[PDB]
Amino acid sequence: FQGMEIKEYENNPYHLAQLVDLINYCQNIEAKLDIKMAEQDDIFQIENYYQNRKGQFWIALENEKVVGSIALLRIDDKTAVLKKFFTYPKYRGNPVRLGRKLFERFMLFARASKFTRIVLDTPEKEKRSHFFYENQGFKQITRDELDVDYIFPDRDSRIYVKLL
C-alpha cells in the first residue's frame, strides 16, 4: 500500500513514542482495558526481550509514523506467542488490511523458525478480533487445557491456537 512499510523494530525514540501512543489507544481509549505500561515493560526493552531471544517485533509505518505492530515471543523450539498486535482503525480491513499484512509477516518468521504452534490471548469482549483470528486459522482453547511455558495476563480473555 502507498507510503507504507512493515519492518523489524530498531531503537528509535520517535517510533517508540508513537508505538506507546498506538498501544495506549487500542488498549485504553478504544477497548477501555485500563492496562498500564508497567504491566508490559517489554515495550521499553524490545531488543533484549524479543529480538535477542529468537523472537521478533515488527512495526508498520505509514509515512514513517507507527500505525501497527506485532511481535513474536519464543517459548521453546515448537511454541511461540503472538503479542502486541495493534493497528489504528482506518488501516483495518479493506483497503489496507494491515492486520493481515502484519499477521503474514509474523508467519514468514514463525515458519522459518520451525515453530509448530502459535498461541495468543484476546479479551473476551473483542468480537472483531476473534473473527479476525478465526479467519487467520486460529481455533479457541481452554486455559486449563493448554500446556505451555507461559502465563497469560489475569484478565477476562480467550486463548487461541494455530498449528503450523
What is the contact surface with its own copies in residues (CB under 8 A)? 13-14, 16-18, 20-21, 24, 36-38, 40-41, 43-45
Tell me which residue has its CB nearest to Cl ion: 99
CB of 44 to its own copies, least distance (A): 4
Phi, psi torsion values for 9, nearest 5 degrees: -60, 140
For its own copies, the closer CB: 60 or 159: 60
For its own copies, the closer CB: 36 or 111: 36
First vs last Cα of the chain: how many Å apart? Answer: 27
User: Distance between CA atoms of 131 and 85, rounded to whole angstroms?
Assistant: 15
CB of 68 to its own copies, least distance (A): 15
Distances (CA, A) of 134 to 69, 107, 127, 130: 19, 15, 11, 6
Closest by alpha carbon to 57, among 21, 35, 82? 82
C-beta of residue 84 within 8 angstroms of C-beta of residue 57: yes
For its own copies, the closer CB: 36 or 127: 36
Please choose which of its own copies, Cl ion, none residue 10 contacts, taking the beta carbon within 5 to 8 angstroms, the exact cut-off set by kind: none
Please choose which of its own copies, Cl ion, none residue 59 contacts, taking the beta carbon within 5 to 8 angstroms, the exact cut-off set by kind: none
CB of 12 to its own copies, least distance (A): 9
Interacting residue ranges for Cl ion, rule: CB under 5 A: 92, 97, 99-100
The x, y and z cell numbers of residue 140, run together, are: 479457541
